[PDB]
Design a protein around this ligand. Structure first.
Ligand SMILES: [Mg+2]
Lengths: 262, 4, 265
C-alpha cells in the first residue's frame, strides 16, 4: 500500500450546492407543461430531502419523499438534471440507497438511469447519472446492484469514452475505480481490466487518467493471480507512457507504483 | 458547468 | 425547515493531495536544523499514515506512527505546515482522534495547536491548526476536548480576525459553525455567548462570501430552538449586523440563509 492505492472504499461526488440545485429545479419545472409539472407540495418534499441530507439530520427520508424523488427523475429529459443532482447527493444516505437499490426493485432504478446514458442524451443527464452510479457504491445495496448490473453499465460507460467532456470522463474513470474497489475486496477482474484499459486509451483529462491508474493499481493489489494476469498481458507496456508525465505529479507517481508490481 |  | 441550518454534524476539511503534502514535507525536512530533522524511517512512517487515511483503510495507524506524527508537528514553525496537513487529514480517523484528543493528553495537544494560532506566526500554520481543530469535531474525543478548551481556543482564534487572509476567515467561520453544532445539541449558554461573540466579531471584518455564508449557518444553528441564544444575539446587535446580507445577489445562498435567520431574530 502507498498513498494512491488500493482504495478500500468508494470514491464519491460529495460537493453540495443545494441552493443552486433547488433554484434550477424550480426554474426548469416552471418550463414544463402543466401535466408534467411538479406541484408546490412535490417541490417542498424535494427541498426537505435536501435539508435532511445537507444538515446531516437523524430524521430519515420518508417513503412519500422518495416517491416524489422517483417521479422527479422521470420528468422530460430536457429538465431532469436538477432532480438527478438531488439523487446524486441523496443516494449515499442508507435509507435512499436501500429503497432505490435493493434486490427486488433495484433493476427498475438502474435501467432507468442507464436509459439516460445513451450517447445522444443531454450531457448534464449523462454526467449526473454517472455520478449517481459512482455514489451508490457507498451502500451495500448499491454495491450489490452495480455488480449484478455490470454488463449493462460497463457497456454504456464505454460508449461515453468519446469526445472531450472532461467531467463525463472523470465520472467514467471514477465508475471504473469504484468497480475496482469491489473486485479488490473479494474473489471478473478481466472484465474490469478491459474497462479501465479501453477508457484510459482514449481519455485526455489528467484527473480521469489518474483515477484510471488508481483503479488499475487497486484492481491488481494483494492478488497474486491478478498481478500475474497483468504482467502476462503486458499491461506495463500500455501504461509506461504515463511514467514520464510530469504534471500533475500524482499521475507519474501512481504509474511508477503499478510498474513496481508488474 | 451545470449551474445556474 | 431549510437547507441551511441547524447543521447536525461537523463541517470538515476533506480535500487531499497527499502527493503535494509528502512532496513538501520531504523537501522542507532537508532545510531543517540538524537536531530537528526527521529521519528516513520517520518519513516512511508518515507516508504510511497518509496511505492508510487516503485509501480509507480498515487498519489503525500504529502508536509508533502517531508518535512520529507528534514529532513532525513539533518541527520548526517555518517548515511544519506539511506535517500539520497530515494531522489535519488524520485527526478525523477515530483512533487518531482518540490518541490526540483523549482526556489524559488532549490538553497538551490543544495547547500546542493554540500556540500555532499566534497572529505574529506563520499564516499556513494558523490556517492548518484551525482546519485541524474543525476536523477533530467529527470524533467523540475531539468534541469533548473542544468543549473543555473552548474559552481558550475561541479567545485565541478571535485574535486572527485582523490582517488575516480569506482562507483563515473561512476556517474561523467553520470553527464557530462546528461549535454551534455542539451547543445546538446541548444548550450551554456561556459557550453559546462566546460563539455569538466570535460570529459578531468576524462579521464586522469579513469580506469573503464563503466565510460569510458559514458564519450565517453557524448563527442559524446557534439560535435554533433557543430563546436565550436569540436574546444574546440581540444584545450584541447581530440582528442589525446581518441585514446587509439580504442584498447579496451571488451566491444566492448568502441572502437565502440570511432571510431564514432574520425570521428568527
Ligand atoms: Mg432518451
Amino acid at each position: 500500500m502507498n498513498i494512491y492505492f488500493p482504495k478500500k472504499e468508494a470514491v464519491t461526488f460529495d460537493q453540495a450546492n443545494p441552493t443552486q440545485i433547488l433554484g434550477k429545479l424550480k426554474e426548469l419545472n416552471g418550463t414544463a407543461p402543466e401535466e408534467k409539472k411538479l406541484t408546490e407540495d412535490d417541490l417542498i418534499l424535494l427541498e426537505k430531502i435536501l435539508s435532511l441530507i445537507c444538515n446531516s439530520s437523524s430524521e430519515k427520508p420518508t417513503v412519500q419523499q422518495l416517491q416524489i424523488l422517483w417521479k422527479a427523475i422521470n420528468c422530460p429529459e430536457d429538465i431532469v438534471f436538477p432532480a438527478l443532482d438531488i439523487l446524486r447527493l441523496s443516494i449515499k444516505h442508507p435509507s435512499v440507497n436501500e429503497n432505490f437499490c435493493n434486490e427486488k426493485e433495484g433493476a427498475q432504478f438502474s435501467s432507468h438511469l442507464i436509459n439516460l446514458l445513451n450517447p445522444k442524451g443531454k450531457p448534464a443527464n449523462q454526467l449526473l447519472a454517472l455520478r449517481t452510479f459512482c455514489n451508490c457504491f457507498v451502500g451495500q445495496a448499491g454495491q450489490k446492484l452495480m455488480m449484478s448490473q455490470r454488463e449493462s453499465l460497463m457497456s454504456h460507460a464505454i460508449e461515453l469514452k468519446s469526445g472531450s467532456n472532461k467531467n463525463i470522463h472523470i465520472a467514467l474513470a471514477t465508475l471504473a475505480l469504484n468497480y475496482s474497489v469491489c473486485f479488490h475486496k473479494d474473489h471478473g477482474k478481466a472484465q474490469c481490466l478491459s474497462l479501465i484499459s479501453t477508457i484510459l486509451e482514449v481519455v485526455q483529462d489528467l484527473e480521469a487518467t489518474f483515477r484510471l491508474l488508481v483503479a488499475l493499481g487497486t484492481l491488481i493489489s494483494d492478488d497474486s493471480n491478478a498481478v500475474q494476469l497483468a504482467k502476462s498481458l503486458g499491461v506495463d507496456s500500455q501504461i509506461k507512457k504515463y511514467s514520464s508525465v510530469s504534471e500533475p505529479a500524482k499521475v507519474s507517481e501512481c504509474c511508477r507504483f503499478i510498474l513496481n508490481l508488474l | 458547468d451545470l449551474y445556474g
